[PDB]
């Protein structure tokens, strides 16, 4: 294979980490640089092709897409990074103090025996008049103008057996880092939804860890230039509907995804097959460089979403279809 992807050693951790962040402007408002999710299988999509000058312009096309469950992500702290002649150094980290049992379990390898004393004395600095947090924030304001916010996922909401949350650093693109830290102050302990950052048809890149094949595979990999197709939310009725079919059904196929739970919460649908297997954690960065190609600028209008069963070979699309076709059965009567 290509020497750039060597050596073939196993990935450092299953949770891949972003190694680069989008360029920041000192005038634009605050905006998150990346998000995280869990690959909850894949599906098939059919959509119109309005691309001009194409051999199949105005026609319909079919493709495969990957669904990633992206529940609300809750902030837990903010970190400042100072530039030096020896790279970036973590000058200061200040936490929300509202650390959940999930992050406590993440910090404790054998939680079932741990006394669960993590973050007890430090809570005093926040559960009073304090002003130590204010002093640290002023220190950050005066000092380095690059800030990263620590967040974790609501793993309990996600239908997974891991039950352990994961920490992730996200950069902010807002100028006047005083404003960045002020926004962090008001958003401390808060949860951000998917639709806040990304938008439909936006071009992004994804990073994950590939499935192991026996060493074979099991390495961190990044796939760039992926177009976001949909951003569905649990509170959004009929997340799997479209303008044409407008069927009041969820993206969850008949019997749910194979080797994964029946997703009924926030999720993102993007072009291509993002690396990583089912239940694998992946991260999504927002196009470090503002590509102006027609491929990125074009929009997509979803026509219909495949929802037939994946285990085996799908016989119908929705449960209402099978029983309607059958009419009656001994299993029923």
């Amino acid at each position: 294979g290509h020497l750039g992807f060597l050596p073939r050693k196993r990935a450092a951790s299953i949770r891949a980490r972003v190694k680069a962040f989008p360029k920041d402007d000192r005038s634009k408002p605050v905006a998150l640089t990346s998000f995280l999710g869990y690959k909850a299988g894949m599906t098939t999509i059919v959509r119109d092709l309005d691309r001009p000058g194409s051999k199949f312009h105005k026609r319909e096309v079919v493709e495969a897409v990957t669904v990633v469950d992206t529940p609300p992500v809750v902030v837990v702290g903010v970190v400042g990074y100072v530039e030096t002649p020896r790279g970036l150094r973590s000058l200061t980290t200040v936490w929300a103090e509202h650390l959940s049992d999930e992050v406590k379990r993440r910090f404790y390898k054998n939680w079932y025996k741990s006394k669960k004393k993590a973050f007890t004395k430090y809570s005093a600095k926040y559960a009073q008049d304090g002003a130590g947090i204010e002093r640290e924030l002023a220190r950050i304001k005066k000092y380095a103008s690059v800030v990263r916010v620590l967040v974790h996922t609501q793993i309990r909401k996600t239908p997974l057996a891991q039950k352990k949350a994961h920490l992730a650093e996200i950069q902010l693109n807002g100028g006047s880092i005083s404003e960045k830290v002020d926004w962090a102050r008001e958003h401390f302990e808060k949860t951000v939804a998917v639709d806040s950052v990304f938008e439909q048809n936006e071009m992004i890149d994804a990073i994950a860890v590939t499935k192991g094949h026996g060493q074979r595979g099991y390495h961190s990999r990044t796939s760039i230039n992926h177009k976001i197709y949909r951003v569905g939310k649990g509170d959004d009725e009929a997340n799997g509907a479209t303008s044409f079919d407008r069927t009041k059904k969820t993206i969850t196929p008949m019997g749910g995804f194979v080797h994964y739970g029946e997703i009924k919460n926030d999720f993102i649908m993007v072009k291509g097959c993002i690396p990583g297997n089912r239940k694998r954690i992946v991260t999504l960065r927002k196009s470090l460089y503002t590509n102006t190609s027609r491929k990125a600028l074009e929009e997509v209008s979803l026509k219909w979403i495949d929802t037939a069963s994946k285990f085996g070979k799908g016989r119908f699309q929705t449960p209402a279809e099978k029983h309607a076709f059958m009419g009656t059965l001994k299993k029923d009567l």
Binding site: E83, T84, P85, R86
Partner: protein
């Protein structure tokens, strides 16, 4: 003469500075080099780049990974040049190498202490007027020194309020000199003048 000697690399010659620092290390004098990125090397920039590349491609034919490592930082380049003038692999050489520290710019607390220079290793004194010369910082940034901007930025930041510190010191020295001058002409001052003080 001094427990630690701070040497400013700006305007100096790499070879002469390395030789003198190695000699001082072998003699037991602790030396710390500052402003390495501002060091200069005789010869044209193109010639310096060619002579760096011909050595970089000479790393090793048998195993590139096990061959030498091309340190791009000017401080590491100066350290390698000095090590080339020291009997490394020996206990005495290893002990001497611990007495040398090289940092880009003037990191603290060295910034608050006096910095000396070596007259016999200055470009202004060793190079003929009008002759081309190469900048160590430019050479490093050409070969992959990605910290040049930050170095200049924080050096300028230091010089900001270094000017203020100098202004305060100058005012204090002027006041002291005026106080001494108005105290002159006294019997003690005249007696000291006779003895040379």
């Amino acid at each position: 003469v001094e427990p630690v000697v701070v040497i400013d690399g700006k305007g100096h010659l790499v070879g002469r500075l390395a030789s003198v620092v190695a000699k001082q290390l072998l003699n037991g004098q602790k030396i710390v080099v500052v402003r390495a990125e501002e060091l200069n090397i005789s010869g044209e920039f193109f010639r310096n780049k060619l002579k760096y590349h011909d050595f970089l491609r000479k790393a090793t034919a048998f195993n590139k990974t096990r061959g030498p490592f091309h340190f791009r930082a000017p401080s590491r380049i100066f350290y390698k040049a000095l090590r080339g003038m020291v009997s490394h692999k020996t206990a005495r050489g290893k002990a001497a190498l611990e007495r040398l520290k090289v940092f880009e710019g003037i990191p603290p607390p060295y910034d608050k202490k006096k910095r000396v220079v070596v007259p016999q290793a200055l470009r202004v004194l060793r190079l003929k007027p009008g002759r081309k010369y190469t900048t160590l910082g430019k050479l490093s940034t050409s070969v992959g020194w990605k910290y040049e901007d930050v170095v200049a930025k924080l050096e300028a930041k230091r010089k900001v309020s270094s000017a203020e510190y100098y202004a305060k010191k100058r005012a204090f020295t002027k006041k002291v000199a005026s106080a001494n001058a108005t105290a002159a002409e006294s019997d003690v001052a005249k007696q000291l003048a006779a003895l040379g003080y």
